[PDB]
Amino acid sequence: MRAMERTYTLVIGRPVVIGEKPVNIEKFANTSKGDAYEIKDLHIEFNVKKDNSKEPNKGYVTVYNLSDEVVNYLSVNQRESLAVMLHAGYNGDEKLIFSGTVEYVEDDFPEETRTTKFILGDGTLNLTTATTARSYRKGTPVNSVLNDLIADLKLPKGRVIDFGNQTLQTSMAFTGNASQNLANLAKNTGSTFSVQDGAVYWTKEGSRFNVMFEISEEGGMVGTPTPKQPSSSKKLIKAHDIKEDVGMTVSTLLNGAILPESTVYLNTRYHKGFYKVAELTHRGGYETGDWITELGLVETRGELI
Amino acid sequence: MRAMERTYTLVIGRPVVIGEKPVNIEKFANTSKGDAYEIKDLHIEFNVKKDNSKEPNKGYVTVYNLSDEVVNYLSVNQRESLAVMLHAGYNGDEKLIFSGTVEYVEDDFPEETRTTKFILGDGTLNLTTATTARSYRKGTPVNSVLNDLIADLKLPKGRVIDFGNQTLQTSMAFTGNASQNLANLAKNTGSTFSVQDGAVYWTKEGSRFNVMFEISEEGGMVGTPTPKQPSSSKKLIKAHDIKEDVGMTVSTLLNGAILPESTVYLNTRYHKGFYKVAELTHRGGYETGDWITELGLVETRGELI
Amino acid sequence: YADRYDAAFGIYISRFLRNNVHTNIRGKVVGVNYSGPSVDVQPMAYTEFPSGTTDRYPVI
């Protein structure tokens, strides 16, 4: 008989180079020598937050007592963006939990124990340097503008909801970073745009997608759900009506197969119903600490897209 | 036989008044009575950070159980900028470690012990109020523009590297604070501008000045050097190339005879070579605490100016 | 959405420009002075927020 013990894996690959086609962090895993630097049995502490907004998802990691060779490989490439993947689970499988580029790295080795630090960004390089220069005339179909701008961003299309037969009412011009322009089109058309684990997600506010996840005491829930406001401020109201404005909170054992834009079903004894996801935070302490995930849910009032 | 014990001195002088010539904090030390208020044998905690950037270097100080007369002298002059100097060393000498103006001061005396607080700025008054209004035509030598703007700033010239026979390509106009205009000229010409302990330093990025300091176990080093990135973010690269982009970290016993723009030689058993300095932080606890200095080094790839 | 530290500054800057930083605008003349030529301008543009509130430029 065994116990139920945690497991994880961390991989470091070649520098990421942006080209003239969508970037996939998967293909950069292999190093010039072939197999990548894998780190399994070392105490690790990490925190990974995810959201549906302009900003990329960022995660922090700490590793104790790394071998000198690995640290040397990171002393080099300090000018470059190494690709990194993280996996976690329970002794039988490990689900992808983050993938991005090493934004920052530093080492402090006071006496007894060295402590390496990381800051990782989910597509930070693309979202902050992809320039654009486009224009359109009166009568252009809005569905064409959306596709044109996304292709400029150079990322795979996770999911998109086209506008239909919508047409521009006035001439438009777009410059600067493509991400910023798209985030502005979100406000005026009730659409949510956010990149996550390399995938572009374009959806409509208020509406939601089946029960892709069910939460219950069998599903490793942790404590009862509690109602928490989804924003730190309140807006004036007429009392688009379809927009968000309500939510709840839940916690569960670590499970990387969840994304901010997904949908979940809450099977508890007090609260029951369907909710959207709005925010994720993954925490982990291998030898000591939690191994759980926190979800911020938001009520929905739109059509079932 | 003795031990190796710490010593320090703190001096407070007359209010600083800016005039029509370079400001020297040295000449304001003497008070109307003559000798200044010197504080030697009182527990003191201080933190002084220094850098090479637009912002002035600021340091914090705390003193316990001050006499009522001294506190009274600071209750007055609360509208004025008193000059302050700080010294530290080891029982045989004390090196100047900071000099500036008292930006802030507050007193809290709950029951047993009063605790005075200070915030000091290195040339804050000059850098934030020196206005300018200048213009030049096509063909003007850039070396003339630089000297004209610095004289406006009203500070002694610590060190400057002239541009040679460079000439303006387009007409230029400068207004507002002189410091801001100079900091903009830095970006477009690969030069570093930063005031420190009253001295103006204008140098060129990438290049460095002899071994003015050597670090080794004999030189009171504290722990091994570790590689730390010199910035909290990574820039996109073509992979001016001469710019910085790499660095290291070291710690040493308190030594005020060091400046951000200097050069140091690192004689350790793993790392060996020459580095620039980029950042300093001086910490101190007289009765209890550290008495060390931390240096952030940056690799160089330019000519040996 | 509103969790990141940068989004807060983004919204704060966006709102700050709304009440200041006026540069150019179209308008229509409503009052004309022929001695020392000057004109009174009524800006035409406006916006309506989702909260049923409107922003009108005053006569200049």
Partner: peptide
């Protein structure tokens, strides 16, 4: 013990600086 607290405050300041300054060609 203030040593422990200063470290956490420093790390939070570092995270905020990273959030403000990231990516970009300049």
């Amino acid at each position: 013990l203030r040593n422990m607290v200063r470290a956490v405050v420093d790390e939070n300041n570092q995270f905020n600086f990273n959030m403000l300054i990231q990516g970009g060609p300049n």
